[PDB]
Amino acid sequence: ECEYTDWKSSGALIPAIYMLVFLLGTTGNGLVLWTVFRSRSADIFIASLAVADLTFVVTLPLWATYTYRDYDWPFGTFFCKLSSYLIFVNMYASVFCLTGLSFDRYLAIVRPVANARLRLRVSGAVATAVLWVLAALLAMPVMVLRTTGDLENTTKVQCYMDYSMVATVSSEWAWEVGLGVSSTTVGFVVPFTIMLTCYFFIAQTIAGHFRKERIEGLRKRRRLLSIIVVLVVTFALCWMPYHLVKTLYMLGSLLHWPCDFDLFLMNIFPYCTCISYVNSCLNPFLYAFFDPRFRQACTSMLC
């Protein structure tokens, strides 16, 4: 058939990107997590988001070494299993924390009275306890199935998901597809729909609650509606790329694509992945650096 190779330039560009995302995400999340942790409502979601995006971008340097060395992993079995799981459950915890913010905002903003009693019961500590346990369970297969070895065809030490413990030749492909489709549906298709509906009902109340006749109302109406668009769009633009290649890539095992088509997906997939770490770097500015009072308080604490 066709020959599949790596992009020559990817060996340097990908681990270099992991670095910038690791340093920028660490500083952004660190300031937010410190400011919230050691000082309003939904502050529990901002701390949980900072932990999620501050711990899912923290292990990126290990992978930067792995890719820079040409897919060589000099860290042993322990870190294959932990690094893969921590970064995986973080994917869940991050998108769930962002979903918790959109739901908490919906309850607080759209019907502040009818939902006054509800928010106290289903949000706050309750929502964050559930998302951290749910994320931990959803990622559990990665801590068990991720392992290390040396394929005789590569002579390199690399992390991989073998699935030899759970599937056979007739079901190995189905196991991969099940995990991919489920992770995407729970990870992105379900969460984004709970954030695009909580923010559409929060961007429909602001419009009617902020009059355009007065310049003060108009200035706030535009700023408040504008950021909501940014919050929803930024999520989609950051995570959609990685959830549009992973799905198409897996499907290429069942569908008939012209080979080089999948080689393209293989070459871009590393960069698409590098797009979800930008979210963990922009998260800190959007959900904890937008409010002026919080930004002023952080500067005083820093100095």
Partner: peptide, 13 residues
């Protein structure tokens, strides 16, 4: 390893 890209990534699918 059955998946084409299980390796050279931290995204164990």
């Amino acid at each position: 390893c059955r998946p084409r890209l299980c390796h050279k990534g931290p995204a164990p699918f």
